[PDB]
From a paper:
TEAD1-4 are essential transcription factors and key downstream effectors in the Hippo pathway. There are four TEAD members in humans, TEAD1 (TEF-1/NTEF), TEAD2 (TEF-4/ETF), TEAD3 (TEF-5/ETFR-1), and TEAD4 (TEF-3/ETFR-2/FR-19) that share high structural similarity and a conserved palmitoylation pocket. Conversely, the two main Hippo pathway transcription effectors, YAP (*YAP1*) and TAZ (*WWTR1*), control gene expression via interacting with TEADs at their C-terminal transactivating domains.
Compound A binds the same site as Compound B in a very similar manner and the only modifications to Compound B were made to include a handle to attach an E3 Ligase ligand. To facilitate structure-based design of potent TEAD degraders, we solved the co-crystal structure of compound A bound to TEAD2 ([Fig fig5]). This moiety provides an optimal vector for the terminal amide to exit the pocket, allowing for conjugation of an E3 ligase ligand via a linker in our TEAD-CIDEs ([Fig fig5] and S5E). Reversible TEAD lipid pocket ligands, compound A and compound B, both bind pan-TEAD but show no inherent cellular activity in the TEAD dependent OVCAR8 cell line ([Fig fig7]). No TEAD degradation was observed upon treatment with a TEAD lipid pocket binder (compound A or compound B) indicating that both TEAD and CRBN engagement are required for CIDE-mediated TEAD degradation ([Fig fig6] and S6B).
Residue numbers in the entry: 217 to 257, 264 to 308, 325 to 446
Write the structure that this text describes.
């Protein structure tokens, strides 16, 4: 009954995340394709964290050791169906909270469980309508993922894409920079959506 209904905690909720591409045409007439997209403008299903330990690093900065530090209720699994049917490649995250903090946002890209690239932004808060807003908008997508996307896109069969994406994950950890306590940890596993449907997501709580 205290279990989350969306991707967030009482201390920090995710408002919106999107990874996208804007073609060069967008200047003449703006358009943008969304690979994956969560919008959050009944309890959530659950998943046993151990079942995914192997899909992420297993030493310092790994899922097993992060979950043991807790708090447990901060851990979610996002299952994406990516829309690979479609420039500037970018990503945008927006969070909210009732407390003024300075967040440190780490995004680990992982292949066969081994960290491959990592990014660590830092977002100070901006109070707006009584609640603090954290905006990491239009951040450039990392060069590894943009290449991955163009390579992934050319595989002749969708089941080959999903074969590759079985071994590709991303891990995000948002922590209070000043106190080191963790606020929200999201694990992302990927599938490619069929050509006819657009991106969708299924969010789960990570339990033990
Ligand atoms: C600044 N340039 C650098 O090189 C430094 C750097 C390193 C790592 C990550 C970033 C930016 N962060 C994302 O790019 C990012 C990307 C994603 C997801 C990207 C796509 C990748 C393709 C897949 C698909 F192939 F499955 F379609 C769909 C998701 C994400 O997700 C939480 C979270 N973050 C930047």
């Amino acid at each position: 009954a205290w279990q989350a209904r969306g991707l967030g905690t009482a201390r920090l909720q995710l408002v919106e995340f999107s990874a996208f591409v804007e073609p060069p045409d967008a200047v003449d007439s703006y358009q943008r394709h969304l690979f994956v997209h969560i919008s959050q403008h009944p309890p959530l299903e659950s998943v046993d964290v151990r079942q995914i330990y192997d899909k992420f690093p297993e030493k310092k900065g790994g899922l097993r050791e992060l979950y043991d530090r807790g708090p447990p209720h901060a851990f979610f699994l996002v299952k994406f169906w990516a829309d690979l049917n479609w420039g500037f490649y970018g990503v945008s995250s927006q969070y909210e909270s009732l407390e003024h903090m300075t967040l440190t946002c780490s995004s680990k890209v992982c292949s066969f469980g081994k960290q491959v690239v990592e990014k660590v932004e830092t977002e100070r808060a901006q109070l707006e309508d009584g609640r603090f807003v954290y905006r990491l908008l239009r951040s450039p997508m990392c060069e590894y993922l943009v290449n991955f996307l163009h390579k992934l896109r050319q595989l002749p069969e969708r089941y080959m894409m999903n074969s590759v994406l079985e071994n590709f994950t991303i891990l995000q950890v948002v922590t209070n920079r000043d106190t080191q306590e963790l606020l929200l940890c999201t694990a992302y596993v990927f599938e490619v959506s069929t050509s006819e449907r657009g991106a969708q997501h299924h969010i789960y709580r990570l339990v033990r």
